[PDB]
Amino acid sequence: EIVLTQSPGTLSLSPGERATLSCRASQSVSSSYLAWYQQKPGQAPRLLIYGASSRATGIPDRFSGSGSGTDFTLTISRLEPEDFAVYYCQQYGSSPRTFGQGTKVEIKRTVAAPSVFIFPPSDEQLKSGTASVVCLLNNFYPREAKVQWKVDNALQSGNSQESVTEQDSKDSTYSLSSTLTLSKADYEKHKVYACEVTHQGLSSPVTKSFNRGE
Amino acid sequence: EVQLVESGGGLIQPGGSLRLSCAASGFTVSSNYMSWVRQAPGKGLEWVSVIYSGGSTFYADSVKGRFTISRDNSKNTLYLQMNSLRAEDTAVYYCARDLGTGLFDYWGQGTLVTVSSASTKGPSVFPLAPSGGTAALGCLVKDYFPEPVTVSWNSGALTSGVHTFPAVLQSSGLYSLSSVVTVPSSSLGTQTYICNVNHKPSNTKVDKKVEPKS
Numbered sequence: 001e002i003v004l005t006q007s008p009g010t011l012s013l014s015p016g017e018r019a020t021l022s023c024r025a026s027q028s029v030s031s032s033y034l035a036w037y038q039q040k041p042g043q044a045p046r047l048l049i050y051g052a053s054s055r056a057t058g059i060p061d062r063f064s065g066s067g068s069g070t071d072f073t074l075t076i077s078r079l080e081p082e083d084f085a086v087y088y089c090q091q092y093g094s095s096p097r098t099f100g101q102g103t104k105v106e107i108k109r110t111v112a113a114p115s116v117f118i119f120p121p122s123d124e125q126l127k128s129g130t131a132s133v134v135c136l137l138n139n140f141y142p143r144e145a146k147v148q149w150k151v152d153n154a155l156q157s158g159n160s161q162e163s164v165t166e167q168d169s170k171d172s173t174y175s176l177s178s179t180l181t182l183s184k185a186d187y188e189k190h191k192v193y194a195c196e197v198t199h200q201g202l203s204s205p206v207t208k209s210f211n212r213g214e
Numbered sequence: 215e216v217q218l219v220e221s222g223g224g225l226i227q228p229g230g231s232l233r234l235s236c237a238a239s240g241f242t243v244s245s246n247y248m249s250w251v252r253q254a255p256g257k258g259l260e261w262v263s264v265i266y267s268g269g270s271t272f273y274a275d276s277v278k279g280r281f282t283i284s285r286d287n288s289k290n291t292l293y294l295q296m297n298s299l300r301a302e303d304t305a306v307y308y309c310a311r312d313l314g315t316g317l318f319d320y321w322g323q324g325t326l327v328t329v330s331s332a333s334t335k336g337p338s339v340f341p342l343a344p345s346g347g348t349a350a351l352g353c354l355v356k357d358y359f360p361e362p363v364t365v366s367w368n369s370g371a372l373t374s375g376v377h378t379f380p381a382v383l384q385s386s387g388l389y390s391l392s393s394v395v396t397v398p399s400s401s402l403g404t405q406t407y408i409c410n411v412n413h414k415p416s417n418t419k420v421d422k423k424v425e426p427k428s
Contacts, residue, residue, distance in 0.1 A: 115350070119343070134354060
């Protein structure tokens with residue numbers, strides 16, 4: 001089930017730069033049985049390159065392919081706004097048609113620190129029987145960010161869920177919402193609730209905390 | 215012009231059975247290799263099934279014994295019969311044409327198959343109140359099923375700075391969503407902010423006013 005491994009998992013490059021994705025196979029496939037496909041969010045895949053060095057009909061001359069044996073390379077000579085999407089390599093030599101796990105090409109903006117806000121549960125929600133504390137990280141880059149929950153300085157893990165927005169169209173920023181859901185009793189048993197953000201854009205981890213009922 | 219239009223996907227309980235259809239335009243289904251390939255939510259592509267020009271059918275191990283591929287030449291349609299559905303089958307499916315026995319050269323638009331053992335439930339809307347310069351507020355739309363949900367601010371009058379987070383599936387089987395917005399803090403007391411949530415599968419519309427707190 002010849003194993004294709006793409007590299008890297010996420011490639012951060014700005015428009016105009018030269019993109020170089022790699023696809024390494026566990027077993028050799030003949031050079032004319034590796035295809036490179038493009039996929040945009042919310043869109044179907046798009047055959048870019050067949051035979052690992054030949055271009056599909058319609059594909060600009062900035063996309064290119066090379067390689068042989070087990071190692072193949074997809075080269076975007078000059079990046080465009082429209083090219084930033086996910087890319088896959090597929091081998092179709094043997095019977096098991098396998099794909100790569102994907103390689104995302106996204107616009108690199110300068111490292112931006114998240115604006116961290118915290119939202120305690122409202123009185124209506126507390127009357128409903130459960131409390132969800134929200135932690136909002138606004139307009140940050142890259143997408144990689146660590147959000148920790150501390151209830152009375154005790155690290156709570158396994159009861160919070162994160163949600164990341166799509167990359168913004170203009171400034172290419174991210175927004176993350178971490179919701180910590182806990183019972184009304186467990187909410188009223190403590191006072192200090194803190195969201196600690198560890199991000200590459202923060203020299204020191206930023207702690208946004210509140211006190212229950214104040 | 216080769217166009218593949220897919221339909222038939224929708225919500226269904228586990229153990230159910232669906233019949234995905236894909237109508238072709240510009241080429242013959244009987245003379246081409248016709249494949250179904252699905253994309254799991256937040257995951258790469260895996261080839262599901264294929265039907266040869268000579269009537270030979272092949273399936274992946276994950277769909278063997280449960281999925282059946284077929285083609286109808288009088289109406290040039292491709293049918294994928296899904297039986298014994300589980301949450302693993304939740305994905306966006308694509309019908310594709312195979313040129314040169316392995317190259318997926320033309321795709322469809324994709325149809326969504328969502329497999330969940332819940333019941334249709336309306337959302338509960340809670341506020342996320344603010345509290346220098348920029349102030350962040352929002353709405354928490356919790357415990358609804360199924361997707362989607364349209365959220366606006368001030369009946370659409372406010373669009374700049376709105377971040378609507380993707381709905382995550384809680385352990386209870388229902389969805390939770392957060393819609394936040396950054397505004398001038400000075401306008402927090404001298405302007406009315408309402409989040410408008412519309413959930414058509416249950417026909418529930420909730421207009422929630424977000425006013426500041428202590």
